[PDB]
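Limitations
The structure tokens in this dataset are predictions for the assembled complex, not deposited experimental models. Users should treat interface geometry with appropriate caution, especially where small molecules or nucleic acid strands are included. An illustrative entry is reproduced here so readers can see what is and is not provided.
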Amino acid sequence: ALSYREAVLRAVDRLNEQSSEANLYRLLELDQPPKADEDPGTPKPVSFTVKETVCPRPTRQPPELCDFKENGRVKQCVGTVTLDDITCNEVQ
Amino acid sequence: ALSYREAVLRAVDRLNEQSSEANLYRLLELDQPPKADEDPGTPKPVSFTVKETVCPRPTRQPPELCDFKENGRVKQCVGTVTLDDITCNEVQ
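Predicted assembly:
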């Protein structure tokens, strides 16, 4: 970017301001943006929906073995999960 | 990812734990990760080098109009700049 390079030059100017050195310095080389990992170990966002099943809540059964209720309630959930904090609201 | 989907399922289990509802809910649909902008307005990292010029520091002259000193000092600078905090160390 232009403003990127323009920020490096303003910085060199500031380095010359906050310096007890005897001479000014100028840009010799602008290197590559030192690699910063994307997708670290921070919480990742999620969005999914759930529907009411026919199983009574206090069950030791995996919800995936539970049938969906005919006209059971559908909820939309958004939030985050840490691979290494969610709210659901009834749809319309 | 597998663990991503596996995190959505553990979450549904937790939603069923922290719920006063009468029935369990199960996954109906897993949506796309709600878009989060990359490259917001946060400080961006930079890496560049500077070399000593022949201009005395207290000058109103743009360093870019100043010649490099023969065997002038070279510094390597790393830090960040906000398009909308840097330290330099003498090279070898």
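Some entries come with short summary sentences. For this one: Chain A has one helix and four strands.
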